[PDB]
Amino acid sequence: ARVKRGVQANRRHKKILKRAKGYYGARSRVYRVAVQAVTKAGQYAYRDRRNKKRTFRRLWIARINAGARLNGLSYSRFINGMKKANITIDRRVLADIAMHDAATFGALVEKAKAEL
Amino acid sequence: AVQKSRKSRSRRDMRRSHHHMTVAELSVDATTGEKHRRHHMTKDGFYRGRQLF
Amino acid sequence: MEVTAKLRGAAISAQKVRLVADEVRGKSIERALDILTYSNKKGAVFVKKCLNSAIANAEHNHGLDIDGLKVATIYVDEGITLKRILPRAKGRADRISKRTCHITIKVGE
RNA sequence: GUCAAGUAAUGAAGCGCACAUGGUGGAUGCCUUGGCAGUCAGAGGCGAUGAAAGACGUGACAGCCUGCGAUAAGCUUCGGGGAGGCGGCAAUAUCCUGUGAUCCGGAGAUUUCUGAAUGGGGAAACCCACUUACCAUAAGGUAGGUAUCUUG
RNA sequence: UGAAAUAGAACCUGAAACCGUGUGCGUACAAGCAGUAGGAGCCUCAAUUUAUUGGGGUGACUGCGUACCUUUUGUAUAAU
RNA sequence: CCACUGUCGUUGAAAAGCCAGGGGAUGACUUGUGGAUAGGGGUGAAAGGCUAAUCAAACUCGGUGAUAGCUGGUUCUCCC
RNA sequence: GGCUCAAACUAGGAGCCGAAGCUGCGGAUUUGAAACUUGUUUUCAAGUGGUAGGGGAGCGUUGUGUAAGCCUGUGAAGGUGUGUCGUAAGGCAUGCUGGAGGUAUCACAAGAGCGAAUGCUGACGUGAGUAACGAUAAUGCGAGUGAAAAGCUCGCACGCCGGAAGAUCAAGGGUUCCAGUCCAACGUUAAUCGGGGCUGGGUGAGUCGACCCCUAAGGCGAGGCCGAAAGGCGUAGUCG
């Protein structure tokens, strides 16, 4: 009962070469290089799934700092004033408001400054 | 003496980019009205209205 | 509309014939024939020969006016390689690739 | 419209990724004329009446393979069979065939040379012989015999 | 002619490496395992009462990021 | 016939050569043909030299899939 | 980078940033505890980094039964894309190519899964259109032929060997010898040319050599001697 590996090997290798589409050079053409690039790509995706939350929190904090300083206050005091006012708005929503609605963020800064 | 890592196809093509075929200039003799290379006599042998043979 | 001539099996490397092909690609048949007949490369005889075959095809089998024809597209492909042995010093042998090429020319308005 | 400042877009000698369409190459799938391991039976030898293995020839047709052996893809005889056939690459031509061909089975005849080779020798397919009988008259042909050992 | 001729004799199918041609986007002030997480622009299909979404192609710019195996106390290792 | 020096060559024209020089060149000389010595054996004006580009024990086949506490490799997935 | 009543140091105070830690939301899973109770359902508690290694649960491929079944020229296998499903191996469907086979479900057996072993076979890359085209004795021109002439034929001129690079043999090879015809492969380039392909022809002996007669070295060798067998030696003789 002999088994030939041709068909299964072909399909196994096509899966990897399909996941390796768009890569440079040997990485998208030959299996020995493509398979490493796909595994390394998965590793990068796994790590950046952690890192993306930090990056976006970073961006929200930067935008909130910019808005607070336009309204006459720093980020470390504006967040403290939020926490003393018992305002639960997250940094994502705060950055959205700062970026797309200046007057509402001004009102928020007024509440924070009244609480400070 | 030898490569440490095989040259890529793009790198190989970049060297080839400069190589180009030469295209000869073309003029027509008034007397015979035939295509011929610039400053070179015609197939028939009529050059600047003169008989070589 | 595209009339084709094929010159499978030229005794010359495709890499050499491609330099000739690049200069006649897209030109009118008159200019291409002039370039090929005043070219100093061996690939030029094969390319002119295939272009003439294509022009004859377009004029005889399809009744086209060769005055308005053009080299619509041309490319050279690698043919079958003849494998030969080259003796070297100290009793060592090397393989020799005597490469061939296939020339495809399509002419049309 | 001029000047000054600032700031876009556009480039492709070549290259990259994707797709479309090709060349090369011969994987894969399917297939087999070929192998492998066994069961149940048969048989277990061939050769001086020249073996096994060969060399050279043999056809209408040049080569190889197959068969054959100067009677040379063959001959005679005895059975089967009834319409095609002169083996294959591989066809062509001349032809054969119901007066039974081709083909199959049994028997017989022919069976060059080397090879145990056995008349002597030898670098296998070669050289040289002796002798009996007959034929020929010329410088030969036909049919035989001529190794060694053992036992009588 | 053949059902079929990219079944045309190197002839069933015809993968990959490798090498061409064509179309779309990017690329000549910018430094490194070449990806990944974002992301403008552009091109292309579909909708949608009409530049707004969905699918696909490319990827300006920003962050992070020194291959695989083996053997080792320990490898991007300039150890195999 | 030999091979003392140097350059070149060293993926060579050549798996030991070419060029310029060099030694013997009537002798313990050189060479043609045939034969004899066979592996723990041969031959050796002796270098462990030569014995078919292989010699501190030739080559071929067999024991044989020698043995290797050594090196290398050891192929699909998920859960504890 | 830059910083001097600091962006340094000392002693305090308040904010904020800051990890895959904790919390929030959704999902999977191991064990254990409760009950419709072999996943039949819902919950709760503690867990779920991992090399060597141990334990558990499966995927796919070849073949056998299921199967004289089912699918299949209204298109099997294979190849190439897309969509979709599962924690994964992977499954399903379908466009194109393909042209004759495949196999559901459950069991059963393995030549059952490759990226590495300076692994084996074949094909194809980089170096790269780079080195090199094999004695530096040498070629120039005019005609001929031809698709094409630096190389072929003829002609003129030039150069090299000439104790050979001339001629006759032995050994070895075996048709390479001559003529016609051809340029796909071979000739390190072109080729009309060739020791290349194809088709024909050519080798004439009493005196040349071989065979033949004779023998050297060395073999073999009725009888004979020796030796577990195989065989070794050796006389007459016979070859050489």
A 10 A CB-CB count for C98 gives 12
**Number of residues in chain A:** 116
Distance of alpha carbon A113 from alpha carbon B2, whole angstroms: 72
Distance of alpha carbon A113 from alpha carbon A82, whole angstroms: 9
Task: Give, in degrees to the nearest 5, the angle at Cα C74 between C15 and B19.
Answer: 35
Instruction: Give bridge partners of residue A8 from the DSSP assignment.
Output: none
Distance of alpha carbon A26 from alpha carbon A30, whole angstroms: 5
- Give the number of C-alpha atoms closer than 13 A to the C-alpha of residue C31, restricted to the C-beta side: 12
Determine, for residues C38 and B26 on separate chains, whether the beta-carbon distance falls below 8 Å. yes
SS in 3 state form for C48-66?
HHHHHHHHHHHHHCCCCCH
Residue B46 CA: distances (Å) to CA of B37, C39, C103: 13, 21, 35
Residue C41 in contact with partner chain B when CB distance is under 8 A: yes
Q: What region, left, alpha or beta, does residue B10 occupy, with left being phi > 0 and alpha being psi -120 to 50 degrees?
A: alpha
Determine, for residues B24 and C20 on separate chains, whether the beta-carbon distance falls below 8 Å. no
Distance from CA of C65 to the nearest CA of B (A): 22
Distance of alpha carbon C94 from alpha carbon B34, whole angstroms: 49
Instruction: Enumerate the residues of chain B whose CB falls inside 8 A of the CB of residue C35.
Output: 23-24
Distance from CA of B20 to the nearest CA of C (A): 6
